[PDB]
Design a protein around this ligand. Structure first.
Ligand SMILES: CCCCCCCCCCCCCCCCCC(=O)OC[C@H](CO)OC(=O)CCCCCCCCCCCCCCCCC
Ligand SMILES: [Zn+2]
Ligand SMILES: [Zn+2]
Lengths: 225, 177, 47, 309, 15, 110, 66, 231, 36, 33, 151, 62, 49
């Protein structure tokens, strides 16, 4: 498995632009930092989007979304009356109006359109252009903030030493996030290790499982008494 | 009594907020209230003093019509003690019973949910209540000269589970706090 | 071991003269925008 | 938007307890460090495409722009593991697709001008100038010069002094110059399909302005269209005359409408937003949090004084 | 306060 | 066959009174301060069948754990694990996640 | 005397979403619990069961029989 | 019923004694809670088996008390709205409404400025004024003429497609009541169910009321039929 | 009509959670088992 | 039937008691003697 | 027509309780903005006259309300009763703190008041103290006012 | 009459299923016959019924 | 045609005291009604005498 590329050079930012609807456009690359994804950099105005809807040149219009805090839902008594924890409110449409416009010729642009604009709403209702809401990305969904925090706190790889290798191991399967990329504990401790810790760890792991099942059965028998 | 009964309703106005059909978190949403209103399921609507709150009264589905459903109290009985029914077969659309005609129960014999609803700031200038009223009161008996008769047309009769809404507004000066 | 990516597959290529009329911002303009950004930054604290 | 269930050995192999959460700076500030280093002149680390790309599509993307499939990623998290339930011999995972906010570049909404040093215009002047560009009105003239309207709404209205109500329009004209209009005070309620002034030039609010903006974008049909429609006796002959008829839009030569929010520069929960609006609830919450940090170990003195009990 | 009442009666919408 | 109510009462009444009693509630549960049968049926632990199945699987587990104890890695396995180790040595968080996503998407397409 | 009201909503704190007057609206609120019209009679059954407990209207008859 | 705790106790409350004595008697031993939620009924057995009975009871009593407090809040709002006062509890928006963007949804406030409209009694708007304002709002005027300006269609989008049974005789069909259709049909195939002696629980699905009684009747008559022939 | 308010930055609630995660997985798993 | 009102009367509306009035009724019936 | 009766029992039930803090999950700028902007917009230095008139009349309303209330005899009895109760509680608390602080620094009836006149029980020392504090608080008002209104 | 009354009560209470011993502990409780701190609390409650000070007594119950 | 006379009263004139004819159900009474903002009420009132 080849490592990803890693180049470095001096680059010159582009000149800034004012499309009327949005401003910016100094990123000189075709991809972004956090994700490796292409960046949309063509901007569609309001009258342009309206005409593209009327004359069928536009197929799908997609809005981004936002989390909709838990206190501002009406489906159950407020959190603070002490009831059981309700799951999660649906997400909002993007208040800032960030939008992606997809044409029939495969082009993809961005735009700013407030959800609920009269003309655009009537056009979408009449001409049946497909309308969609882009789901939320995982580092912004409110139900996976625990996973995001755990990833930001815990270590990616683990600790195994044999006296001569000190291998960076992956974490166990029960908490390995991505995939089996590096060494697993067993393979490392058996390929660069000695039967001492091999046998010890194997048999006392058996001892742990036996203790689990034996405690289960023992409290069962106490229940019988 | 004729006089005193009135006087007492003003001094003790707090004992008359509906404490019968309203049990817990009895709110409904504004969209659901509109949807119930447009299909003529609401029996009474009581707007309140400030014009921004209503208590919608909706009859229990089996107490809405005069079907003889055996989940209701036997109010009206035959000689052989069977509940009476008033269904009529709707000649234009048979094969579907939910589109038949039926008379509605007198309002004093109804079970009713009493939901609470908050009306938006532009409830009156949006005209929803006005459209509903103007549509539902624009039908009545007519004279047909082709048959020389007095006809109550079908599109002015109540189908199954539909009722006739009564709108009532309250006066803030009747509170005597 | 690493792989290599051509540095012409990573940079955009367009010359500002292929843009609409007023899209290119002059220095006169761009400086006033920075001035407004700063003033909007300090407004409420100042007041 | 469709979700998917994964019940398969190899797909649950590359999964584990759930894919990693790609992380970094916030979606609207990823480009600050890179751009300031680029403006200084240093070398910058180059962006590496995503691990699902391969060399065959970078050829097209660097040439003719990305497709809706080039932007879509997936994410899957594992429900109960291998030995938990029947009909699930080695686990079950839930996978859904999405597009991240980072796809939007270093683009933002137009900057709020300096309302002190900017020439003003009366609402009646904006109303008349919008009527003169509304082809359905009795005051149309096709010799009008283009206008660019940016309609701003305030966002620091509740968190910070100096917030304003209503809307503010920035009108830029052929000279490249700019003026602004202050549409507080929704004047008198009118519907959008309304053409009549309000009996006093002082009752022009944003309801009339929005009426004019809505009516200006009406598509115009040439008389031939409904001529071929009505004159056609057949029903689907009319249908053909209708589906084939075209139109035009004069507003694309007169107006450019945009909507913006003047961003806020004070976080609604921060400390400086407490000095700007002191309140007693704030000081109670503050001393509670301070007890949490410093002296909630009061409930450790609890256990320590439970020693004699 | 009766001098300013015609002014302050716009916050309610009446005359 | 032979429901509960048919025993405490049975021939003391006809079938009329038996159906009379049958249509009024199960026996005497939560509304009457007692404990439901479906409530009581949860307070009991796993019985000896499951415990013995677990003990037999435990015998199997110790057998295969000592079997693993008797294992030693093959020839190319050392080189493969060491190459993984080298990649992990020259790894950063971002790129390791990069290869994780590479794995997932490659096996997704297959 | 010191209570003032918002002049846009007239003290309602809430405006209408007009599109929903004539896969739903993503801008306007969330539904309530008693909106599900298919669960009405079940909720009423639970509530009348819980209410029959406290109900002390028939108290004297139960008392004389006890 | 007093022995099974199915109903409240023997002489716990007296309508003519006092409020204090009655709250004392009711606050004594979970008398305010029904049997189903009384924790004493369950405090003795809960362990490894399910780990739920003592959890799924304190997780129901909580929802119960939340419902009760919500009812109190709603009634305080109604009592404020009975006069023309502003409501004390601001609740979040619902499925047809959005929040106001001048206020945050906080509808009113206190200001240290005396609000002259209340002090002089001018806070209600004189019916004729409102009538005029509405009648002028629902009647938009057209000053232009579609002859000069070549406007052939009323405003809106996609007017061309817009320009291209016996609902007029028997009204429209109501689509909010399909879920009862089935039961209605049963009530027509079995007239005997309308007898004044019977009173079923109530409901619509196969899990409620009429269908429960019907299934029970057919099943028990089949049981007895099979029991007749074996002997 | 239809309103035109726009915020500049959508407020993603950035800046316990275990129960949220658990209820998420419980709801999804229960839907899965009810699919069969 | 053509000349009937559909607004019933003030007189032909029969009484219906709530639960509190039912309780008052049974008490006034039992303490009758 | 039946006759109705006064209800004298657990009446209301929903008022015995303060639940404001539960429903808002705790566990007014549009107002002033709109007031001031309206008196600015409707009616040189005239906005300043109107604003000063507004503030002055508001403060005077509150002061007149308070004084007129306190001018009823029974309200003065209420005030007197509260004063003596609070004084006895202060005596208790101060004695406790004084004695225990004396210890740790060594380490480190009602009717004679309730039935008499109140200006003869209270010394003049406290009136002089209150007057001194008030005087010192409000003595910078002329210079402040002058320097404000002169640009 | 008594049979019908019990019938209706039973039906409406057993609607619950349509979706030590509490008695022996309920016989041992302090009830006011229609324990001196109890009478104190009851009197003090019934005396401060109207004033807000009443709320202070509410937090004196077990 | 059962109502004879209506009398708007109040300080803001939205309540009426309707009087019923002899042919009305219940004879002749005086009933108070509170009115919503309906701009079709006055035509209906005058065109029925
Ligand atoms: C004629 C002037 C009438 C103007 C009153 C208009 C509404 C009064 C709102 C007061 C609310 C104060 C309050 O929160 O109410 C509470 C407050 C309780 O403290 O109520 C009170 O106490 C009321 C105090 C008594 C008010 C009477 C004083 C008015 C006349 C002054 C003396 C006549 C002056 C001499 C005549 C000179 C002839 C040239
Ligand atoms: Zn508002
Ligand atoms: Zn909506």
């Amino acid at each position: 498995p080849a490592l990803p590329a890693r180049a470095t050079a001096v680059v010159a930012p582009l000149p800034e632009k004012n499309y009327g609807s949005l401003r910016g456009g100094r990123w000189p690359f075709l991809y972004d930092n956090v994700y490796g994804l292409p960046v949309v950099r063509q901007v569609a105005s309001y009258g342009e989007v309206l005409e593209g809807i009327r004359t069928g040149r536009i197929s799908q219009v997609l809005w981004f979304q936002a989390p909709r805090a838990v206190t501002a839902s009406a489906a159950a008594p407020p959190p603070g009356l002490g009831g059981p924890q309700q799951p999660q409110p649906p997400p909002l449409a993007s208040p800032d109006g960030r939008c992606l416009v997809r044409f029939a010729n495969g082009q993809v642009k961005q735009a700013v359109i407030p959800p609920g604009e009269p003309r655009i709403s009537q056009a979408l209702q009449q001409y049946g252009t497909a309308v969609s809401y882009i789901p939320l990305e995982p580092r912004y969904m409110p139900e996976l903030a625990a996973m995001r925090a755990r990833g930001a706190q815990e270590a990616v790889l683990g600790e195994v030493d044999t006296g001569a290798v000190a291998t960076p191991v992956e974490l166990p399967e029960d908490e390995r996030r991505g995939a089996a990329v590096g060494p697993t504990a067993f393979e490392a401790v058996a390929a660069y290790g000695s039967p001492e810790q091999l046998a010890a760890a194997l048999d006392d792991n058996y001892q742990a499982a036996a203790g689990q099942v034996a405690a289960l059965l023992a409290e069962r028998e106490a229940w019988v008494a | 009594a004729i006089f005193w009964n009135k006087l007492l309703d003003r001094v003790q106005y707090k004992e008359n907020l509906p404490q019968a059909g309203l049990v817990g978190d009895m709110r409904i949403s504004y969209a659901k209230f509109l949807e119930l209103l447009k299909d003529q399921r609401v029996k009474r609507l009581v707007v309140y003093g400030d014009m921004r709150t209503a208590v919608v009264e909706v009859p229990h589905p089996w107490s809405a019509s005069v079907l003889g459903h055996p989940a209701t109290h036997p109010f009206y009985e035959d000689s052989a003690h069977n509940r009476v029914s008033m269904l009529r077969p709707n000649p234009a659309a048979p094969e579907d019973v939910t589109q038949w005609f039926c008379a509605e129960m007198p309002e004093w014999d109804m079970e009713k949910y009493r939901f609470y609803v908050d009306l938006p700031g532009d409830f009156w200038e949006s005209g929803v209540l006005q459209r509903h009223l103007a549509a539902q009161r624009a039908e009545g008996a007519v004279w047909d000269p082709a048959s020389g008769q007095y006809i109550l047309p079908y599109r002015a009769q109540k189908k199954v589970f539909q009722v006739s809404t009564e709108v009532q507004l309250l006066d803030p000066q009747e509170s005597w706090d | 071991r690493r792989e290599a990516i051509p540095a012409e597959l990573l940079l955009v290529k367009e010359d500002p003269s292929k843009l609409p009329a007023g899209v290119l911002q002059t220095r006169e303009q761009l400086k006033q925008a920075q001035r407004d950004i700063n003033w909007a930054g300090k407004r409420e604290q100042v007041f | 938007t469709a979700e998917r269930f994964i019940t398969d050995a190899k797909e649950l192999n590359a999964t584990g307890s759930g894919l990693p959460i790609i992380d970094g700076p916030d979606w609207e500030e990823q480009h600050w460090a890179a751009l300031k280093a680029m403006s200084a002149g240093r070398p910058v680390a180059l962006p590496t495409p995503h691990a699902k790309f391969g060399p065959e599509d970078l050829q097209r993307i660097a040439a003719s722009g990305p497709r809706l499939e080039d932007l879509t990623l997936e994410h899957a998290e594992r429900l109960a593991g291998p030995g938990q339930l029947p009909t699930a011999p080695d686990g079950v995972a839930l996978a859904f697709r999405y597009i991240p906010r980072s796809v939007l570049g270093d683009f933002r909404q137009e900057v709020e001008p300096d309302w002190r040093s900017l020439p003003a215009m009366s609402p009646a002047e904006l109303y008349a100038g919008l009527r003169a560009r509304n082809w359905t009105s009795a005051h149309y003239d096709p010799a009008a010069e283009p206008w660019r309207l940016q309609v701003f709404s305030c966002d620091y209205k509740h968190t910070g002094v100096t917030g304003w109500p209503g809307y503010r329009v920035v009108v830029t004209s052929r000279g490249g110059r700019r003026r602004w209009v202050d549409l507080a005070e929704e004047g008198e309620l009118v519907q959008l399909t309304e053409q009549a002034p309000p009996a006093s030039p002082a009752d022009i609010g944003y309801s009339h302005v929005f009426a004019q903006l809505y009516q200006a974008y009406e598509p115009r049909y040439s008389p031939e269209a409904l001529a071929a429609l009505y004159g056609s006796s057949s029903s689907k002959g009319k249908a053909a005359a209708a589906a084939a008829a075209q139109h035009d839009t004069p507003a694309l030569r007169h107006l450019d409408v945009s909507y913006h929010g003047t961003g806020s520069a004070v976080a609604p929960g921060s400390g400086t937003a407490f000095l700007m609006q002191p309140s007693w609830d704030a000081v109670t919450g503050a001393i509670r949090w301070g007890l949490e940090r410093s002296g909630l170990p009061e409930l450790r003195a609890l256990r320590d004084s439970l020693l004699p009990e | 306060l009766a001098l300013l009442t015609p002014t302050l009666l716009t916050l309610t919408g009446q005359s | 066959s032979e429901d509960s109510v048919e025993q405490e009462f049975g021939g003391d009444y006809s079938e009329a009174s038996l159906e009379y009693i049958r249509a009024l509630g199960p026996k005497k549960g939560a509304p009457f301060a007692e404990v439901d049968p479906a409530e009581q049926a949860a307070a009991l632990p796993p019985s000896q069948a499951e415990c013995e199945a677990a003990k037999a699987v435990l015998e199997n587990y110790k057998r295969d754990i000592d079997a693993l104890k008797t294992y030693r890695p093959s020839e190319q396995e050392r080189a493969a694990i060491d190459a993984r180790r080298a990649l992990a040595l020259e790894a950063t968080p971002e790129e390791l996640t990069w290869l994780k996503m590479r794995e997932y998407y490659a096996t997704q397409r297959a | 005397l010191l209570q003032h009201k918002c002049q846009r909503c007239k003290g309602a704190g809430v405006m209408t979403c007009p599109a929903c007057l004539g896969g739903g609206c993503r801008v306007c609120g969330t539904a309530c619990a008693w909106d599900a019209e298919s669960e009405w009679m079940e909720r009423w059954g639970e509530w009348e069961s819980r209410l029959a407990y406290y109900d002390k209207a028939t108290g004297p008859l139960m008392d004389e029989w006890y | 019923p007093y022995d099974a705790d199915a109903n409240l106790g023997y002489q716990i409350v007296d309508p003519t004694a006092s409020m204090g004595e009655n709250v004392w008697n009711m606050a004594q031993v979970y008398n305010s809670l029904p049997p189903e939620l009384n924790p004493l009924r369950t405090q003795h057995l809960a362990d490894r088996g399910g780990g739920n009975t003592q959890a799924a009871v304190e997780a129901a009593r909580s929802a119960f008390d939340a419902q009760v407090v919500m009812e109190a809040a709603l009634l305080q709002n109604l009592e404020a709205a009975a006069q023309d006062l502003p409501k004390p509890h601001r609740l979040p928006p619902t499925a047809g409404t959005v929040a106001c963007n001048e206020c945050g949804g906080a509808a009113w406030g206190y200001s240290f400025f005396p609000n002259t409209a209340v002090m002089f009694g001018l806070e209600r708007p004189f019916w004729g004024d409102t009538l005029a304002r509405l009648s002028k709002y629902w009647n938009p005027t057209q000053v232009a003429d579609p002859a000069r300006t070549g406007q052939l269609l009323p405003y809106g989008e996609g007017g061309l497609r817009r320009l291209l049974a016996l609902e007029a005789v028997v009204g429209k069909a109501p689509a909010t009541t399909g879920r009862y259709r089935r039961d209605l049909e049963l009530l027509l195939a079995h007239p005997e169910l309308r007898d004044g002696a019977l009173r079923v629980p109530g409901g619509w699905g196969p899990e409620g009321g009429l269908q429960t009684y019907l299934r029970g009747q057919q099943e028990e008559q089949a049981r007895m039929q099979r029991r007749r022939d074996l002997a | 009509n239809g309103h035109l308010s726009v915020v500049s930055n959508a407020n993603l609630l950035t800046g316990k959670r275990l129960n949220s995660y658990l209820i998420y997985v419980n709801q999804n798993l229960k839907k899965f088992i009810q699919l069969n | 039937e053509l000349m009937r009102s559909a607004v019933p009367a003030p007189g032909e509306v029969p009484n219906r008691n709530s639960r509190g009035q039912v309780a008052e009724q049974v008490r006034a019936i039992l303490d009758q003697y | 027509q039946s006759e109705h009766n006064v209800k004298i029992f657990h009446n209301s039930w929903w008022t015995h309780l303060n639940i404001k803090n539960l429903v808002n999950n705790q566990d007014s700028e549009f107002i002033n903005s709109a007031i001031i902007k309206s008196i600015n917009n409707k009616t040189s230095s005239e906005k300043e006259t109107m604003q000063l008139l507004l503030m002055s009349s508001s403060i005077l309303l509150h002061l007149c309300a308070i004084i007129s209330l306190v001018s009823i005899s029974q309200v003065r009895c209420f005030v007197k009763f509260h004063l003596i109760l609070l004084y006895k509680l202060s005596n208790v608390y101060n004695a406790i703190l004084n004695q225990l602080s004396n210890k740790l620094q060594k380490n480190l009836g009602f009717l004679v008041e309730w039935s008499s006149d109140f200006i003869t029980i209270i010394p003049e020392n406290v009136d002089i103290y209150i007057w001194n504090v008030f005087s010192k608080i409000y003595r910078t008002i002329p210079l402040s006012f002058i320097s404000t209104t002169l640009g | 009459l008594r049979s019908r009354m019990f019938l209706n009560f039973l039906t409406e209470r057993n609607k619950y299923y349509l979706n030590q011993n509490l008695r022996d502990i309920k016989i041992k409780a302090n009830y006011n016959n229609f324990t001196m701190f109890r009478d104190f609390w009851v009197w003090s409650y019934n005396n401060t019924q109207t004033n807000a000070f009443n709320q202070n007594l509410w937090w004196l119950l077990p | 045609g059962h109502v004879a006379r209506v009398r708007f009263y109040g300080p803001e004139k939205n309540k009426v005291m309707a009087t019923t004819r002899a042919s009305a159900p219940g004879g002749e009474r005086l009933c108070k009604v509170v009115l919503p903002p309906d701009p079709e009420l006055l035509d209906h009132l005058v065109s029925n005498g």
